[PDB]
Amino acid sequence: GMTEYKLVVVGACGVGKSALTIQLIQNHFVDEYDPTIEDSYRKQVVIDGETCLLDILDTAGQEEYSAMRDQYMRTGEGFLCVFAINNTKSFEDIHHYREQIKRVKDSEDVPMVLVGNKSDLPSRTVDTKQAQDLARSYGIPFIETSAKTRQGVDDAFYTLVREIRKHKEK
Ligand SMILES: C[C@H](Oc1ccnc(-c2noc([C@@]3(C)CCCc4sc(N)c(C#N)c43)n2)n1)[C@@H]1CCC[N@H+]1C
Ligand SMILES: Nc1nc2c(ncn2[C@@H]2O[C@H](COP(=O)(O)OP(=O)(O)O)[C@@H](O)[C@H]2O)c(=O)[nH]1
Ligand SMILES: [Mg+2]
């Protein structure tokens, strides 16, 4: 049967979670997508010659630590932690997202990729080295993306699938 991979995209409002997701789903850059819409989207993709079903939860809205919201995030098998390379605050938020993922998955070993989005823009405020070094601190991959140009989009999502496979084989 076709394996389904439940992927969750997290990070500060405005970093490009929806734009990244829609680039994967529609193969189109959407510069405008209601910041409050949290929803999931499926797509069949070929990754290393194996057709699989991705189920992407594009998170949005207010931070809430109810049991209900924990259970919804807990359905995720892997997480993209997204910041924007021109927004230092979004990068400084990453550790909070990672901490909450570890808590809700009750694991120090959750499949995860650090994503630096908006790589097409010139206004960088977060050095690549600092981002690479944070991913190293966590022991996870770092991928530079642009939802505008499609740079890194498959790399980010497909690496996460590969991380989930390797975790499932542990
Ligand atoms: C960086 C923060 O801001 C926001 C703003 C919006 N969301 C968050 C946020 N943190 O984790 C999460 C997720 C969705 C991530 C996956 C796992 C779980 S499990 C659960 N219950 C979740 C929730 N709500 C989450 N989201 N944080 C700063 C710092 C604290 C005050 N605050 C202003
Ligand atoms: N130049 C550029 N703008 C982007 C990129 N991704 C998203 N945006 C813009 O960033 C803003 C927020 O994007 P959105 O997808 O709504 O972010 P979300 O709140 O994380 O879902 C919008 O103005 C988008 O046009 C990107 O890679 N490059
Ligand atoms: Mg959004």
DSSP 73-127: HHT-SEEEEEEETT-HHHHHTHHHHHHHHHHHHT-S---EEEEEE-TT-S---S-
In the sheet that 50-58 helps form, which strands lie side by side, from edge to edge?
Answer: 39-47, 50-58, 4-10, 78-84, 112-117, 142-144
Q: What is the DSSP letter of 134?
A: H
Task: Write down all domains in the chain, each with its CATH number in brackets.
Answer: 4-169 (3.40.50.300)
Q: Which helix (H) or strand (E) holds 71?
A: helix 67-74
Please give all residues whose CB falls under 5 A of ion ligand 3, grouped by chain where several chains appear: 17-18, 60
Task: Look up residue 86 and give its two tokens.
Answer: 């021109």
Which technique was the structure solved with, according to the deposited record? X-ray
Measured in angstroms, how far is the CA atom of residue 17 from the centroid of ligand 2?
A: 7
Task: Establish whether residue 124 lines the binding site of ligand 1, counting it when its CB lies within 6 angstroms of any ligand atom.
Answer: no
Q: How many CA atoms lie within 13 A of 95 on its CB side?
A: 6
14 Cβ contact list (under 8 Å, min separation 6): 35, 84, 87, 90
- Asked whether 121 and 86 are in contact (CB, 8 A), the reply is yes
Which atom of ligand 2 has the smallest separation from the CA of 146? 27
Q: How many residues does the chain have?
A: 170
29-33, long-range: CB within 8 Å, 24+ apart, which pairs?
Answer: 29/147, 29/148, 29/149, 29/150, 31/148
Which atom of ligand 2 has the smallest separation from the CA of 12? 20
Task: Establish whether residue 61 lines the binding site of ligand 2, counting it when its CB lies within 6 angstroms of any ligand atom.
Answer: no
Task: Establish whether residue 73 lines the binding site of ligand 1, counting it when its CB lies within 6 angstroms of any ligand atom.
Answer: yes
Residue bearing the CA closest to ligand 2, atom 7: 16
Place of tokens 């190293």: 136
* Resolution limit, Å: 1.0
Helix 94-105 × helix 67-74 angle, to 10°: 90
